[PDB]
Amino acid sequence: PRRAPAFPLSDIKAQMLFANNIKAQQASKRSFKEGAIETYEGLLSVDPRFLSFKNELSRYLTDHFPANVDEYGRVYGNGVRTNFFGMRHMNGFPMIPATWPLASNLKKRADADLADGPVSERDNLLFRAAVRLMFSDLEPVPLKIRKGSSTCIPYFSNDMGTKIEIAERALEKAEEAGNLMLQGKFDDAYQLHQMGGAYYVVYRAQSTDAITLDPKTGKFVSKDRMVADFEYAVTGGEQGSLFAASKDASRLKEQYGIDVPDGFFCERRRTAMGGPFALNAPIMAVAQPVRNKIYSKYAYTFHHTTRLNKEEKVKEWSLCVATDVSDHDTFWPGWLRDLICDELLNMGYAPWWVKLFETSLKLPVYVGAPAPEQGHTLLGDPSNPDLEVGLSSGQGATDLMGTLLMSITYLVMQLDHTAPHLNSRIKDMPSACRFLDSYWQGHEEIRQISKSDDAMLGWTKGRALVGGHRLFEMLKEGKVNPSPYMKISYEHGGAFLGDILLYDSRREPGSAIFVGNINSMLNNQFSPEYGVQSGVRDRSKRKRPFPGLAWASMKDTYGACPIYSDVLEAIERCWWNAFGESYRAYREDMLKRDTLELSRYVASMARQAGLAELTPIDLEVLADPNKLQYKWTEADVSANIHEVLMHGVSVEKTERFLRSVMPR
Ligand SMILES: [Mn+2]
């Protein structure tokens, strides 16, 4: 059913993806790399004292605080959902090999019994209504760019000046490039305007992954992570193999002279993609206004800030169902891309813009280094983009694509299993739009709070209520998938956007509270995804600009966890045993240094201003800006802090661009 074309780096098609500069050329050739991350300044992830600390702490916490999750996946009591063994990884050393990204998910979806299009006309109207509501009356805003982010194919520039030039030129030339693509002249659009080419595959660490302690021997077992070899990826699973990657860390002693303590493993590695920035800029120019619309008009369903902001909504529900989606990005359907594009064309969106948008979700992928002596291969032909990878992580509107698919998928699940009497309200496009507009504002008796593949489904006092309980029962039983679109299950230990929903004896949303996930505190403090990058002079360009700041927001983020105090004391005791030092004093020093360093970046901040004016969100984001890409948005961050991490293209240039894209 059609193998995707593949080209080695030596091939001209792959060579064309990399500009004649050191950064781009290094990116093309970058071999498999592994090594200990600098967890904190002067501390490596594999430091023997640090691993001794992690061994003692993970064992102690699991022992004293076993998971409190009921048969329905509801968290109660201590607020713990699993063991604390997830920290037992040799950060910077990946599982081998990493997966080759699937060039086509058509067979993956078909074999998982998932739909190749909207099942009913109602569903077709609902997916189309989602497009209409999300993309309608948009307001232009400056195109914001993350400082230090790469422009990827073809330039691989990290320079803000160069990135602003690229983005402004892209907004000027998007029309001409889109029109070339409409003529099937993809190579011309890429050669002239760098719009096309491929996504650049980077493998990102999922620093913590499941580990269990088998009671019979007291030996640890890491969660098997299935990977596709090259053959499987190009054939969409028709040929080749899907097998468990090796997380065995024994190799580190022989290869690097690193002592590997018992029950420590290599990290899970996930595919992540970097989009060609010239193609992403025109997409982002529309995506940001869309976010502003959905987070304002549809704030009920889409705008999530604090644990209390989420709590106010959930407390009003009679039933709360915390869902889980299996491998969202890889299962994301291409037919949805086509439906979205078709509906945007119907709305009167510029055909050239829709073509750029369509093309961004069919683009080839350049595979770097999944393992030693593997990779450096382009999948798909950039002359005619036709990949079905699912959702590319580096596409300019990935969050919106995931949110659109999932919001409608959950609504359809609630309609199918709990609310058939609402079907008559969805007769045509105007009525589908009225219903969806009402549903998204939380005005219906069936409700939801969602962001991409994370959601909580709600039922108020209902006639759909009884159906809601049957659906929850079906999810617990787990024998039948409740959706035709994606593989849905219930979350084992229900959480929403990092916050655990802590139930009491009644097991009802009305008396349940949202608390910080204590395990995430431990993940963030002891298993960061990246090193401190102390060699990167401009801190605003680092993956972790001000790590010390997370100490100041810790009480606010995690304080409500039942075991918060117990964990901090266990950390102090274990850190004393391993280093002969106070962890609290160590973090207070890092906080002091990072607070002082921050004033250099903030114009409004005097030489020794302090953190008084900053919110806990601002502090969590300054320690980890990756939270700005999955947890929060621009509006949630103080304006003076947003300027530290982002720079923008003028609203004058974007306003003119947006007027040319949008209907009338
Ligand atoms: Mn969840």
UniProtKB/Swiss-Prot annotation:
Broad enzyme group: transferase
PROSITE patterns to which the protein is assigned, alphabetical: RDRP_PHAGE (PS50522)
Sample GO molecular function, one term: RNA binding
Gene3D superfamilies according to UniProt: 3.30.70.1600, 6.20.410.10, Phage p2 RNA dependent RNA polymerase domain
Keywords (A to Z) from UniProt: Magnesium, Manganese, Metal-binding, Nucleotide-binding, Nucleotidyltransferase, RNA-directed RNA polymerase, Transferase, Viral RNA replication, Virion
E.C. numbers: 2.7.7.48
GO CC, any one term: virion component
Residues annotated as domain RdRp catalytic: 309-484
Catalytic activity: RNA(n) + a ribonucleoside 5'-triphosphate = RNA(n+1) + diphosphate
Protein's GO biological process: DNA-templated transcription; viral RNA genome replication
Compartment(s): Virion
Cofactor: Mg(2+); Mn(2+)
Binding site for Mg(2+): 453, 490, 494
Subunit record text: Part of the packaging complex composed of RDRP, P4 and P7. Interacts with P7.
Described function: Rna-dependent RNA polymerase part of the packaging complex that packages the viral RNA segments, replicate them into a double-stranded form and transcribe them.
Protein name: RNA-directed RNA polymerase
Phylogenetic placement of the source organism: Viruses, Riboviria, Orthornavirae, Duplornaviricota, Vidaverviricetes
